[PDB]
Amino acid sequence: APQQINDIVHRTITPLIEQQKIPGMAVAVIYQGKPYYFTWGYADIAKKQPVTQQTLFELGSVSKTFTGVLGGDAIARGEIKLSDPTTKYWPELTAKQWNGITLLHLATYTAGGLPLQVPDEVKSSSDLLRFYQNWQPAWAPGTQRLYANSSIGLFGALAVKPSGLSFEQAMQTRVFQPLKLNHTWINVPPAEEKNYAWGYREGKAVHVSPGALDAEAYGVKSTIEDMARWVQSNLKPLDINEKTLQQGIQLAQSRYWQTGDMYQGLGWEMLDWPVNPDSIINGSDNKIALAARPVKAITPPTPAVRASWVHKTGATGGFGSYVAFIPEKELGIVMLANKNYPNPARVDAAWQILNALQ
Amino acid sequence: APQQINDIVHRTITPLIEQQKIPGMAVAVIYQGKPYYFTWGYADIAKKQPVTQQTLFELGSVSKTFTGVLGGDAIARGEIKLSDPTTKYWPELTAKQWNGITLLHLATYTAGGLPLQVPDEVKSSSDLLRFYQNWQPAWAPGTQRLYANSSIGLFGALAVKPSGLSFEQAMQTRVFQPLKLNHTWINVPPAEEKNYAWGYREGKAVHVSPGALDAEAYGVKSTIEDMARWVQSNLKPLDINEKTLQQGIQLAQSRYWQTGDMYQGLGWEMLDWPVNPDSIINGSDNKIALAARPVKAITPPTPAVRASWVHKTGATGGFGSYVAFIPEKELGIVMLANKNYPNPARVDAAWQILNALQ
Ligand SMILES: *[B]([O])([O])C1=[C]C([N]S(=O)(=O)C2=[C]C(S(=O)(=O)C3=[C][C]=[C][C]=[C]3)=[C]S2)=C(C([O])=O)[C]=[C]1
Ligand SMILES: *[B]([O])([O])C1=[C]C([N]S(=O)(=O)C2=[C]C(S(=O)(=O)C3=[C][C]=[C][C]=[C]3)=[C]S2)=C(C([O])=O)[C]=[C]1
């Protein structure tokens, strides 16, 4: 634990925790490829359980990065193609608005306005079918980006159909296990409930509620150690043995669309490095990250760029997460909290830390 | 070499040499990853110099597969992007018709009708510039594929621009050398002239003549063992130590475009395996291969497919070549002759051999 890293992390995080009134937090800095952990506060306030390197946190939409890589792995396996029509994998989706909507569009939120949330009324496979059949796009495919669980969520469910495996079974078998993420779950096992931190919203202990496509859009829970390992994997996919998984990670970091100084990947979002702090800090604010924005197509997509600031924010009703890394510097960071707080604060703290380490 | 291979090669190639009256020939069959060589006739009729594993043949447009991989390597290095306008690498190309024409278009013959040949009168950099500034499109970019030295030739020249290296130096240091192709040259040095075979056209001995963008479009000369090595590298790039070259080879085999049952890559052309022999055999006829055909964009490109028949025909006034391989079966073949005989005959022979072997 070099003092250099120790000081910047504590000087940055300590004030953050107090200002935002965060109950518990865990941080990992990947420096020169090695991980360094830090923890604060409580996982369970009621029974004074502290946050440890084994505490499980709800990742919220950071889960989308796993979904993007799983999809990319299915592509490398030749099971699917981003160029394939959404109907090729779900024939019963006969409504005319689907005609030219591809898996690429679903994966990158550019299908034409799929909604941020899948209605709570949707549950059955049938209910899900009606939802997408009755949906009316606002724009043509590939013209505008609208962040949505309905898009990437569907991408995830369809990308695994050729496998014959459940989305969960495919994730654990093709991503979790190969990478040694032995404490990363879509469904928390009874044996791990003791490590499952509680989330806090308005002082109440809460856990994410079940919902259609939850696993594919915001259902993963992990530890700071597994997330650090997840970061190292995305930092240097070349060190991964499973050929298709190595390839899947590279595809998830490719640049498919551009809006402003931001590039959309599969789950991951990227910006050229050196990046402008204000661009990423102010860009993370929901009011901006959730808005409808026209996109320019990158034809063909740009293969993962080493000199990039790769990241993803994530939240549930009671948790707030953030992951960011720079492949070219072999530097990265993970911040997990059992309190949902402003994205700008997360990104500012991460920037302050990584910029200080180079 | 196993009698299975010796048997099918001897019964297929020897009759071919007799029928086409080929002076000299070299064939290499890659079986289960290992190469086996066969040679016939003379490299130099007068002086009766035999064809050996050290004989250099002019590859013709098979050179385009090298240009494609060098281009792919430059992409992997982050020096260029296929999405970028052609004018970004050639600020001098200001004519309005070039707006919208990207490196991708140049590399895949989809620019809009760039001519098959660069006029013989065009020599200087000055001649080249006004030639391109004066070119007028037959179609809009990205709509029709017209095989041409003018397109891929310019792609090659611009692709190495960022490196500051010459095309020959870039190719030598980034492709030939890392793959141990120690007897492959763009410009044959004095010490290798005794191994440089003569081509034959109407009985007269001939060598390819100099021309604008020749190096980038049809200027490579190689031996049968170097080419077998080239096939092995393209068969399984995961065995290549140089990261960017490994990726560059995989990029050259990606499917950017589709016309009929064939897909256009960077230099390489591919078809799904199993393939209809009649398709590739008749499709090889220049009456077809040199004709414009509408293309369907593959958005985004499909990463190199293992179950593919990958190939490329090549010829000069005195030479005829052919290379083809099937990644999924670690099977491939190289055919070099110092006589330019019909493409369909080359492809039929090659299909007879590989189909008998797998
Ligand atoms: B992702 O973290 O960007 C994300 C995830 C979800 N699904 S969820 O069930 O995890 C919930 C998140 C919230 S929230 O208040 O953090 C939020 C964040 C952004 C936009 C709206 C609400 C409450 S439940 C959603 C979702 O369900 O809308 C959105 C984004
Ligand atoms: B490529 O082999 O498909 C190719 C190469 C060239 N350049 S070249 O200077 O090597 C010449 C080739 C010929 S040719 O008669 O073998 C031929 C082959 C295929 C199509 C047309 C002509 C004569 S010079 C060219 C070119 O036009 O210079 C075309 C294709």
What H or E segment, with its residue span, contains residue B85? none
Alpha-carbon distance of B309 to A164, in angstroms, equals 28
Is the Cβ of B76 closer than 8 Å to some Cβ of chain A?
Answer: yes
The neighbouring-strand residues paired with A326 are A331
Which chain A residue is nearest to residue B258, measuring alpha carbons?
Answer: A83
Chain B residues within an 8 Å CB radius of A104:
299-300
Q: Please count the residues of chain A.
A: 358
Residue A282 Cα to ligand 1 middle (Å): 19
Asked whether B149 lines ligand 2 (CB < 6 A), one says yes
Nearest CA to ligand 2 atom 11: B316
Experimental technique = X-ray
Q: How far is the CA of A59 from the centre of ligand 1 (A)?
A: 11
Nearest to B305 among A78, A251, A302 (CB): A78
* Ligand 1 proximity of A6 Cβ (cutoff 6 Å): no
Q: Which residues are A263's β-sheet partners?
A: A258, A270
| Radius of gyration, alpha carbons of chain A | 19
Q: Check pocket membership of B200 for ligand 2, CB cut-off 6 A.
A: no
- C-alpha to C-alpha distance for B245 and B237, rounded to whole angstroms: 8
Cα–Cα dist B339/B57, whole Å:
10
By CA distance, what is A74's nearest residue in B? Answer: B303
Beta bridge partners of B272: B308
Closest-CA distance of chain A to residue B287, Å: 30
Is B175 strand, coil or helix?
helix
Do residues B89 and B79 lie in contact, with contact meaning Cβ atoms separated by under 8 Å? Answer: no
With a 6 A CB cut-off, is B315 part of the ligand 2 pocket?
Answer: yes
A58 φ/ψ angles, rounded to the nearest 5 degrees: -80, 125
Partner A contacted by B298 (CB < 8 A): yes
- For residue A135, the one-letter residue type is W
B1-358, CATH topology level: Beta-lactamase (3.40.710)
For the annotated binding site of A for a beta-lactam, the residues are 61, 117, 147, 149, 315, 340
- Peptide bond just before A35 cis, omega within 30 deg: no
Contact status, residue A110 vs residue A145, Cβ threshold 8 Å: yes
- ∠ Cα B91 B92 B95 (to 5°): 105
- B61 close to ligand 2 (CB < 6 Angstrom): yes
How many angstroms separate the CA atoms of A172 and A135, rounded?
32
Q: Touching check for A143 and chain B: CB below 8 Å?
A: no
B220 C-alpha to ligand 1 centroid (Å): 58
Token readout for B181 is: 């192709």
A-contacting residues of B 208-247, CB under 8 Å? 238, 243, 247
Is residue B103 a contact partner of residue B81, using CB atoms and an 8 Å limit? yes
Query: Does any CB of chain A come closer than 8 Å to the CB of residue B102?
Result: yes
Spell out the SS3 assignment of chain A.
Answer: CCHHHHHHHHHHHHHHHHHCCCCEEEEEEEECCEEEEEEEEEEECCCCEECCCCCEEECHHHHHHHHHHHHHHHHHCCCCCCCCEHHHCCCCCCCHHHCCCEHHHHHCCCCCCCCCCCCCCCCCHHHHHHHHHHCCCCCCCCCEECCCHHHHHHHHHHHCHHHCCCHHHHHHHHHHCCCCCCCCECCCCHHHHHHECCEEECCEEECCCCCCCHHHHCCCEECHHHHHHHHHHHHCHHHCCCHHHHHHHHHHCCEEEEECCEEECCCCEEEECCCCHHHHHHHCCHHHHCCCEECEEEEEEECCCCCEEEEEEEECCCCEEEEEEEHHHCEEEEEEECECCCHHHHHHHHHHHHHHCC
Contacting residues of B for A299, CB less than 8 Å apart: 82-83, 102, 104, 297, 299-300
Catalytic residues of B: 61
Measured in angstroms, the resolution is 2.1
Instruction: Record the tokens describing residue A216, joined without a space.
Output: 């594919």
* C-alpha distances in Å from residue A301, one per residue of A258, A315, B56, B303: 10, 28, 38, 12
Q: Is B301 helix (H, G, I), strand (E, B) or coil?
A: strand
A60: CA distance to ligand 1 center in Å? 7
Closest C-alpha among A320, A326, A318 to residue A343: A320
A61 is catalytic: yes
Residue A191 tokens read as 């044996």
Residue spans of the domains in chain B: they are 1-358
Is the minimum CB–CB distance between B83 and chain A shorter than 8 Å? yes
Quick one: closest CA in B to A72, which residue?
B303
Among A108, A153, A103, CA closest to A131: A153
Q: Minimal CA–CA distance to A257: which of A130, A142, A160, A136?
A: A142
Take residue B38 and report the two structure tokens written for it. Answer: 């066969």
Which chain B residues are closer than 8 Å to A83 by Cβ? 298-300, 302
Protein residue with least CA distance to atom 28, ligand 1: A117
Token digits of residue A88: 């090729």
Q: Which ligand is nearest to the CA of B321?
A: 2
Ligand closest to Cα of A312 equals: 1
- Note whether A125 contacts B: Cβ–Cβ < 8 A: no
A-chain residues near B243 (CB < 8 A): 238
Q: Is B116 on the interface with A (CB under 8 A)?
A: no
Residue B276 among known ligand-binding residues: no
B286 pocket-lining for ligand 2 (C-beta < 6 Å) = yes
Nearest to B256 among A243, A300, A302 (CB): A300
